[PDB]
Swiss-Prot record:
Binding locations of ATP: N36, D78, K97, F123
Gene that encodes the chain: HSP90AA1
The organism's place on the tree of life at top rank: Eukaryota
Compartment(s): Nucleus; Cytoplasm; Melanosome; Cell membrane
Parent sequence residues shown: 16 to 223 of 732
Species of origin: Homo sapiens (Human)
Protein name, as recorded: Heat shock protein HSP 90-alpha
Length: 208
């Protein structure tokens, strides 16, 4: 069973802006996703301080980057606190409505697209490089679900089975045809060092 939803108008407009604005500095998408992963990891870390059983679904707190040139995908995987089905539908746990409003106002005051993460909506910068995004997540309090959107005003949510993760979130970027540089090892290393050099969790770049 697949459920199809319409984005809130403000979010559809944010995504359209990201997709259609001329802006060459696309590489900042990765730091925004790594930042979200770090936040999710902080959350499960702090929770586990008073309830160790929260880590029964996995003790290791880390981030993996997985390029695949055959599929033309870049996948960011973390073992953070994950998201419930409800939070997936509610704009994947972000304050998208109020965040988008503040972001647009900032763009009128001299801000540019690279400031997007300051307003809680950095996830949508994924559409600078991806034609489709799949978000697979598992929270301790719910089952495993897959969110997906190629923009155009809608997203889908379904249950996900076949490769269960213990806990956390996996963001699969289906890259646009002209953005395959982000599958190259030296390019990914360069971007991590430039924008995500000091993060409180290990980042592992998989080899092909
Ligand atoms: C509510 C304040 O934060 C936001 O509005 N947005 C940033 C944010 C949202 C959800 C998460 N998150 C949680 S909680 N659990 N998993 C995630 C998570 C979400 C994403 C995007 C799909 C939004 C991600 O790339 C990685 C994550 O671990 C982390 C940061």
């Amino acid at each position: 069973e697949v459920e199809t939803f319409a984005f809130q108008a403000e979010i559809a407009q944010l995504m359209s802006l990201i997709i259609n604005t001329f802006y060459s500095n696309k590489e900042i998408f990765l730091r925004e996703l790594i930042s979200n992963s770090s936040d999710a990891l902080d959350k499960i870390r702090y929770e586990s301080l008073t309830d160790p059983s929260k880590l029964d679904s996995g003790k290791e707190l880390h981030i993996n980057l997985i390029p695949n040139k055959q599929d033309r995908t870049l996948t960011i995987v973390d073992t953070g606190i994950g998201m419930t089905k409800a939070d997936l539908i509610n704009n994947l746990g972000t304050i998208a409505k109020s965040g988008t409003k503040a972001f647009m106002e900032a763009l009128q005051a001299g801000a540019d697209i690279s400031m997007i993460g300051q307003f809680g909506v950095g996830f949508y910068s994924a559409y600078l490089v991806a034609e489709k995004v799949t978000v697979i997540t598992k929270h301790n309090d719910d089952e495993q679900y897959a969110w997906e959107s190629s923009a155009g005003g809608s997203f889908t949510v379904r249950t996900d089975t076949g490769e269960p993760m213990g806990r956390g979130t996996k963001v699969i970027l289906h890259l646009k045809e002209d953005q395959t540089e982000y599958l190259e090892e030296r390019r990914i290393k360069e971007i991590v060092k430039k924008h995500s050099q000091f993060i409180g969790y290990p980042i592992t770049l998989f080899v092909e």
